[PDB]
Structure formats: C-alpha cells, structure tokens
Amino acid sequence: SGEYPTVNEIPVGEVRLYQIADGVWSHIATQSFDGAVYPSNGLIVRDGDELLLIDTAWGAKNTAALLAEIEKQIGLPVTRAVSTHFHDDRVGGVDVLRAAGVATYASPSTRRLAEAEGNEIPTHSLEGLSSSGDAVRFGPVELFYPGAAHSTDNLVVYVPSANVLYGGCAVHELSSTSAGNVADADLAEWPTSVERIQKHYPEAEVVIPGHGLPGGLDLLQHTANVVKAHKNRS
Ligand SMILES: C[C@@H](c1cccc2c(-c3ccc(CS(C)(=O)=O)c(F)c3)c(C(=O)O)[nH]c12)N1C[C@]2(C[C@H](CN)C2)OC1=O
Numbered sequence: 001s002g003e004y005p006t007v008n009e010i011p012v013g014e015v016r017l018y019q020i021a022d023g024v025w026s027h028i029a030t031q032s033f034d035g036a037v038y039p040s041n042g043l044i045v046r047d048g049d050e051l052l053l054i055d056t057a058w059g060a061k062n063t064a065a066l067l068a069e070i071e072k073q074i075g076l077p078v079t080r081a082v083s084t085h086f087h088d089d090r091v092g093g094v095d096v097l098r099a100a101g102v103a104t105y106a107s108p109s110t111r112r113l114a115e116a117e118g119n120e121i122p123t124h125s126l127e128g129l130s131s132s133g134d135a136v137r138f139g140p141v142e143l144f145y146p147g148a149a150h151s152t153d154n155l156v157v158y159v160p161s162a163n164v165l166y167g168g169c170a171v172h173e174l175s176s177t178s179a180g181n182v183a184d185a186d187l188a189e190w191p192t193s194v195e196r197i198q199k200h201y202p203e204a205e206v207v208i209p210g211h212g213l214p215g216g217l218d219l220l221q222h223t224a225n226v227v228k229a230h231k232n233r234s
C-alpha cells in the first residue's frame with residue numbers, strides 16, 4: 001500500500017511496479033536461487049508513447065508477469081529492453097521479451113558472457129561502452145560503463161529528465177551487510193568504479209540498487225564501504 005515492496009511481500013511469480021518519478025517506475029520480483037529467495041529490481045522509462053525496459057524480472061514466468069503488470073498499470077507497449085549484465089536476474093526472461101516483440105539489447109561483453117554461461121542472450125549489441133567512463137544515449141536514458149564491479153560487464157543507467165540513477169547490481173541498498181553475490185565480481189576495482197559513478201552523476205536524486213530499497217546518493221558511498229569491508233574480512 002505505498003511502501004517499497006519487499007522480498008517477504010512478493011510471492012515468487014508475481015511482479016510489482018513502484019512509481020519513482022514522472023515516467024519512471026521500478027519493477028520488483030522475487031526468485032529462488034540455491035534454496036533462498038531474493039528480491040530484484042529493474043526499471044521502466046517512458047519513451048513518448050512507448051516504454052523502455054531495463055532488466056528482466058529474473059526468469060521467464062516472472063518476465064511474462066512483468067509484461068502483464070505493465071499492460072495493467074501503464075498500458076503502453078514495451079518496445080526495447082536493455083540488460084545491464086549477464087546474470088539471470090538481468091537476462092532471464094529475454095526469450096519471453098523477444099517472443100513478445102521487444103527488441104533486446106546488451107553490451108557485446110554481456111552477450112558473450114551470457115552465451116558462455118548458458119543464460120539467455122539479448123539480440124542487439126550496444127557499442128560505445130567498452131572502456132570505463134564510456135557513455136551512450138539510448139532513448140530517454142544514458143547508459144554508462146563505470147568499470148568492473150559486481151561483474152566485469154555491469155552497466156548503470158541514468159534518466160536525465162528525473163535525475164534517477166539506476167545502479168543495477170554495482171550498487172547495494174543501505175541495509176546491506178556484505179557485497180551480495182560476488183562470484184563474478186572484482187572487489188579490488190569496485191570502489192574505483194563506484195567513484196566513477198559518483199563523479200559522473202553528482203546531481204542524482206534517487207539511486208536504485210539492483211536488489212533492495214532505493215535511496216539517495218548515500219547508496220554509492222555505502223556500496224564502496226561494504227565492498228572494501230568484504231575484501232577486508234575475506
Ligand atoms: C543471479 C545472481 C544472484 C543470485 C542470488 C543472489 C544474488 C545477489 C544478492 C543480492 C543481495 C544480497 C543481500 S546483501 C547485499 O546484504 O548481501 C544477497 F545476499 C545476494 C546478487 C547481487 O548481489 O547482485 N545476485 C544474485 N547471481 C548468480 C551468480 C552467478 C552464479 C555463478 N555461476 C552465482 O552470481 C550472481 O550474482
């Protein structure tokens with residue numbers, strides 16, 4: 001009823017939307033992985049009379065439910081989607097999107113990693129993002145490659161009309177106590193990549209993590225802190 005929805009508030013297979021700003025929503029879904037349930041976020045951005053989707057809802061059935069929720073709550077067609085790295089919480093559901101008429105995009109790095117790991121593969125490659133600090137425009141957003149962090153391919157998304165920074169899984173929520181799933185991470189470079197985000201988007205008003213609650217710019221510094229401490233404990 002208005003609060004940001006949480007993991008215990010969304011059954012696996014349902015999707016919620018949350019209004020972030022004019023023409024900007026997050027999507028929230030839950031999924032089981034190795035015997036535990038986790039929430040995950042994505043983004044929806046109005047693109048005239050169409051919508052741009054950032055990230056799947058972590059699975060085929062979740063992503064079909066996402067499309068149905070968009071049709072119910074917004075009623076504009078999703079025409080393009082961008083996946084911000086190669087893990088299943090970002091690309092799982094790309095086949096559902098593609099069969100629904102959505103054009104799917106990711107960096108060449110993401111596409112190669114998804115293919116090699118057996119995850120679903122976005123159709124179109126996003127050039128111009130291969131060096132840290134690179135940025136390109138994509139409809140109503142800017143895509144930014146900050147460097148290796150949660151994964152070597154992770155991208156961040158900025159919505160300039162609303163000063164919304166979607167960090168994806170390179171950014172953690174304020175309540176986080178560790179750096180999440182670090183299987184494919186570069187803990188040594190992650191603080192430098194977060195610093196690049198901070199320097200590139202100093203006017204961000206809302207920061208959305210890949211999992212958990214949005215907040216303000218403090219999510220970036222908190223992420224650097226938890227990552228350094230993870231490496232320090234380990
Ligand atoms: C699909 C994704 C994945 C699965 C399950 C959990 C997570 C988390 C996560 C996020 C938050 C917290 C709370 S917290 C900050 O307080 O710790 C947490 F506990 C876990 C994340 C994320 O951190 O982005 N991603 C997760 N996968 C799988 C894998 C590829 C496989 C290797 N082949 C392993 O590396 C992934 O990332």
Ligand SMILES: [Zn+2]
Nearest residue numbers: 085087150169
């Ligand atoms: Zn990941």
Ligand SMILES: [Zn+2]
Nearest residue numbers: 089169210211
């Ligand atoms: Zn993640």
